[PDB]
Symmetry: D2
Subunit: 460 residues, 4 copies
């Protein structure tokens, strides 16, 4: 008579090493922004369960991504990151997951051709369950909705309480999703020829299909050249999609830390919640736990940069989070907004470039670009977004640095949460399918089209 079902929880594995634990305990002491307010005794319970479950990724996989990213940081691959703004447990379904990966790969092929160079594919998925808040109380006068990792989307005070059981529901969800994403991509869903076939079907039918035919045709034909050529095609059957989410909830993040075998190398501390995680704009304080936390772990990390960023602060990131000068170890993600990315960005890049360190310069053109529409709904303009990428490019091309890649919020559903692009979404259209639990994201059409427009940036 309560419409839900309580799943009961459980034999601890051996603790991490006293030496690393001291280094870790020392790190976590620093003030943590945006953490949830739930009781410590309870968190510790749930963390204890997390520390003994199977991890959503593994060290071999991540060191392997560190190498690929390395190659991006070196300007020889390009990085594509994308998926839901916020992942909601109710919607972590096979169809939704198929569609977001389908989307990511559809751009992947378009960006791959355009970039003329391998693309590294990272999904926002299997862990993007917590967000930062601005406001203590939301408009409905309720405690902020902080991501299903922390609380329910429903506007009922019960729903909103920070509930750390949610840490585990997070975990089961991310697993499930992860393990689908793997099956999907190891099976035919990331075939090049199929993913492309979806792309053709897009051109047949987008309003702006003209805009795209020419390039879509080159792609077909350069693909067909591959079989003309007889190059062994198995590598065309399967695509690697890594998993990323913002590391916000340190209890979950801390919970999922593990030591590597050490067989490949001396044992390191990694975060197995995900493959790479970033630190947001609100949690990035230099002297804070989040930056500290990113310091300890080996995963590739990223840090978001918005307008307040000062090249000197940039640098300090670089010296904190990339002390060893491992290229691609750290990514920095411009999110100025289109109007300011040209002015704001250049200095940063140069100050950072001067350092030594090679970092991925990745453009997030979504978080700088959000505005409320006359009709109620939070929104983003396709043009302003495109545009920021164009600016991001222009900044790097001018400075002779590498435009590492893009970070975007998209989905496979035909949502109407972003205005414009070939479908010409109108503020009224927005009511029809605003099914995002947070930031408005590029619909499957807007994502593709965006990747066409970015492909054309990459060939200039």
């Amino acid at each position: 008579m309560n419409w839900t079902v309580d799943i009961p929880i459980d034999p601890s594995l051996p603790p991490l090493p006293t030496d690393l634990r001291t280094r870790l305990d020392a790190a976590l002491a620093k003030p943590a922004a945006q953490q949830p307010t739930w009781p410590a005794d309870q968190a510790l319970a749930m963390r204890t369960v997390l520390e003994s479950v199977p991890p959503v990724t593994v060290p071999s996989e991540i060191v392997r991504l560190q190498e690929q990213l390395a190659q991006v940081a070196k300007g020889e691959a390009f990085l594509l990151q994308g998926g839901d703004c916020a992942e909601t447990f109710m919607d972590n379904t096979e169809p939704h997951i198929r569609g977001n990966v389908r989307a990511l790969l559809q751009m992947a092929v378009v960006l791959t051709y355009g970039a003329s160079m391998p693309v590294v594919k990272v999904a926002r998925i299997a862990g993007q369950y917590a967000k930062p808040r601005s406001a203590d109380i939301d408009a409905l006068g309720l405690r902020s909705y902080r991501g299903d990792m922390i609380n329910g989307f429903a506007p009922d005070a019960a729903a909103r309480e920070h509930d750390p059981s949610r840490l585990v529901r997070a975990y089961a969800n991310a697993s499930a999703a992860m393990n689908l994403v793997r099956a999907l991509t190891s099976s035919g869903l990331a075939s090049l020829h199929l993913v492309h076939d979806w792309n053709r079907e897009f051109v047949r039918t987008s309003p702006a299909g003209a805009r795209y035919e020419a390039l879509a045709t080159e792609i077909d034909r350069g693909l067909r050249f591959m079989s003309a050529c007889g190059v062994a095609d198995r590598n065309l059957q399967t695509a690697e999609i890594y998993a990323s989410h913002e590391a916000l909830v340190l209890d979950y993040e801390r919970a999922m830390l593990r030591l590597s075998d050490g067989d490949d190398g001396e044992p390191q501390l990694f975060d197995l919640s995900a493959h790479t995680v970033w630190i947001g704009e609100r949690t990035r304080q230099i002297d804070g736990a989040h930056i500290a936390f990113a310091q300890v772990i080996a995963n590739p990390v990223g840090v978001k940069l918005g307008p307040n960023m000062t090249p000197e602060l940039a640098v300090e990131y670089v010296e904190r989070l990339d002390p060893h000068n491992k290229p691609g170890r750290l990514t920095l993600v411009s999110r100025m907004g289109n109007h300011k990315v040209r002015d704001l960005l250049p200095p940063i890049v140069e100050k950072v470039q001067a350092t030594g360190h090679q970092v991925i310069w990745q453009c997030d053109p979504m978080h700088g670009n959000t505005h409320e529409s006359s009709t109620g709904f939070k929104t983003r303009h396709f043009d302003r977004i495109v545009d920021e990428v164009q600016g991001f490019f222009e900044v790097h091309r001018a400075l002779g640095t590498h435009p590492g890649g893009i970070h975007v919020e998209i989905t496979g559903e035909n949502v109407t949460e972003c205005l414009g692009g070939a479908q010409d979404i109108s503020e009224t259209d927005l009511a029809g399918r605003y099914e995002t639990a947070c930031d408005p994201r590029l619909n499957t059409q807007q994502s593709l089209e965006l990747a066409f427009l970015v492909a054309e940036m990459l060939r200039d």
Copy 2:
């Protein structure tokens, strides 16, 4: 504490699949947990939305490869905990069963001299049958974690349908991890073989086997020397399987996919392949007929009690389309009866012209009780059963198609015998099974060698 999941508030079956499934599930169903329909239904509703543990493309893939084994051109290895447990469903235990299975796969690959299709008893082996309802302690029998708990107490043994969603939850996570594991370094042939070599050094019967182990090293080195030591060797495909025991479970994880033949059909996406057990195989039973509706390759355990004609009905029902490898028939007779009992069954089935995989479950036939109190197996008897399994087949020119064994990566002491000479006295030291005794790491591996030799003769 506990975690709370919501009940949703979903594509219609083609009229025929609905009828056939329903007809299917109306028949009598043995060994089903006794929990309420409301609550079972509820659990089902959750599950009918979770992401599947496997996906169709893979099962078809597995089919193509089982056809290979069927036709005599590949060998099947199926191996795992006898009953996985939620408590033990950890990175180490998973990692080590995956390794134990892989290590036998390489020895087996080299002895077959054909590919071994590798199927783990993992990601859903949470449900057992029981023949006596009331346990030895007078407590209700443990049916495995998807139904109830081991802890020997009234409360714990009550059937908890919360276990269905919990079981799936542990299913995904192991699956996720096995996929992650087999596609990163854990399955590098070379890396796996090195593990085997360690075994030959430190085994007590290293010598016995070192020779064959050297011939594999030489095999494997040979590949490099021919400049073919490439991508294929860095990865292996491990398929998830379990007995399709709980119909509220399998029914929930069903999913409807299109067929390249172009009619839609139902796969059970709780595992790549599932098998009906000895106790659930009634021909007009819910399980057999369920097994007739799902696309998945199925297997059927076969008892000593089995008769050629029944086996044929099994074949004409599970395999009404004569697709090779749709149907495995797993013999378990014990070493003492396998020679007498199996052939006629082989001939009549063979006479039909369907090609099934004949697979040998050595473990299940051969169970016995210690005088120290523990349910156990003798390594010697297990080997003998696979032994005469082979002789039966050679003698008819039929294909000994693969083996089904219960093993673990842990150095357990649940089986007597092997190089170790595990003893009834010894069993009391690490006997961590939730259920049937497993070959530990040394014993599976050992049995792998001994089987490959059976393979070379």
Copy 3:
């Protein structure tokens, strides 16, 4: 004191089988057009030497080409054949051979992309040493120069005598060339990336490089997409170039016949002078030895067709030379001329199509297109040639048949034996490098450019 050097000649291998010899003896009895007039006793000597030397090709190689061609006849690959009009012993040098293969592969990549489908590469080489004659006496009043297989190019009566030692010099030459062609292509010379690099260098510098840049750029990028994609590239390191020549001198051709192992299949009679050979316009008489000869051997054969051809005669070819309906066993090569290919061709194709048999429809746009220039020199216009291909296409596209490929005369040298194309060769230019011993051929530039123009035909 004679400026030459006589190389002495030699132990017979076992004869071919009495049964096949009877079939063969019976076949050769038919009148042979255009054979040389040299003494039979001598021919027999030289044939005896040929029958025991190592063959320039092997059966495995040829059955393997029969399959590829099959695929062309089925409209799924495209056939490219080209090299010298006439090969002269003096010029069968490593540089000249490099350049003609370099040329053939340069078009090969361009046609491959354009065709969107594998191209089968056959060189006119390692055996194109004999030609047919029109005229008993040439203008200089001398016995016709018939190819170095038969006599010397020099205008001295001594040179012109039909000398059957020349059969062997042919053989040594063809070997030498063949074995270079193999080494070259198994080594880096048929790398895709290198061959393409030559192509880029062509665009940088042809006058008509604009015309070509766009497509050249697609090619680069679709190539770069291959490495972006990570497809195993060894297949991109090496190209198979088969050898073809016209089978004119039956003594040489007969001399080189061998029986296969039979291990793959029942033993067949093949011609190991070459991989595939064609029968010319003058030697193709139906009741003649040349057609008979092509009947006996398993090699893929072709027959040239010019304006006099009547679809019924076409058919009889088809029923004679492809009795078993093996697709791609027989190729028929239109050489109407541009003005007539549109009118002349259609009926033939349809009459032949109606038969059952699948034959490669290959366009020779060179032999229909030759005219003498005001300045003395035999010549061909780039446009008329292009044009014939365009017509050949148009004929097939209209009939919904497959345009199998092209047969062309080209070289790697920057000769000026053909007028026009991007360099705008003028009749006066022609004196500068008319180094062809026969028909004027496309210079390395005209060949490429031709392949650009044909690539554009294939994408319509």
Copy 4:
């Protein structure tokens, strides 16, 4: 009759290469044919235009791979007629030597457990040295077809520089054919192995070897079972080699190519690799210094007479840049002296820190004369020499790097011993060598097995 070739009526060497080559060729040159300069020059002029038998890209390729053998990570096999002949330069003889060499390559590949670089004495082994000018019959000695004819008559033995261009002519044709052969079916591992199996059935000592032959089949089957039985196995690279005996020949086939290091250098494109012989190795001789100007990997035969210090000079001259595998040093001592003589030579050379390939020429040391009149070898002695060749190397931890043998595909009877027990009486039946006696098909193969075992210990 005869065929007449014209004399032409061609890129200048960089001043240094011209000087160095000239300086090179001015030194004294032993064992050179005695024909006139005009005529030799003429022949040269022809040749300086013929297409080369090999090309640079390949020789560099061969170098990279010889470095592998040098470093201990690959094994070198070099095998052919002792002197090819124009008369025998036919599709069958070629096809069968290529096969005989390949068949040893597979047994050897599997025993080394590393790649065998396979180098044929083919496409130019037309020139021999002679120690006595006047032959046993009082006729001028036969120096091989590139110089003169076998036919035992005055006329035939006169040095005919027409032979230079004829020799190239036969060179190309064999080369063309070996390339054609090795890239079409003749070199399929599988196809080759099947040939080996036939050998084990019908050999008289099949048994002796059947075991090892089964372990290769199993090796080779293993590749398929791991799904790696791909393109690489359908082809093998056979490199042409011969002794660089005739300087009018090698000098003519020289060609100048660019170096990726970017300086131009001269390769001899008459073969992939060439070796100086025992009689032509004078340190200040034309051959050694020629061998110092060409880019090609070179090898140097080494006599019993050899001293550690000379061997070092050889290394410091042929290998002045310390590139591994630029230089092979081929021991031939006979079984009786190899153990005593070779080590010190190994140590001093090793002491230098250049890495050479140490290769064993078993045949040349061990020659002896029948009492039936025929020059012969005992299979037993040949094996023993490779034997102690290995012991020497194991004993120093140096790398036994490969072997150089004279074999043929023909069932000849030119060597005593082997499973066949070829006998002095027997030698008179098929003793078709133009020169040194060859291991026939059975004997090469046999020696391959026996060597691989030397390889497994």
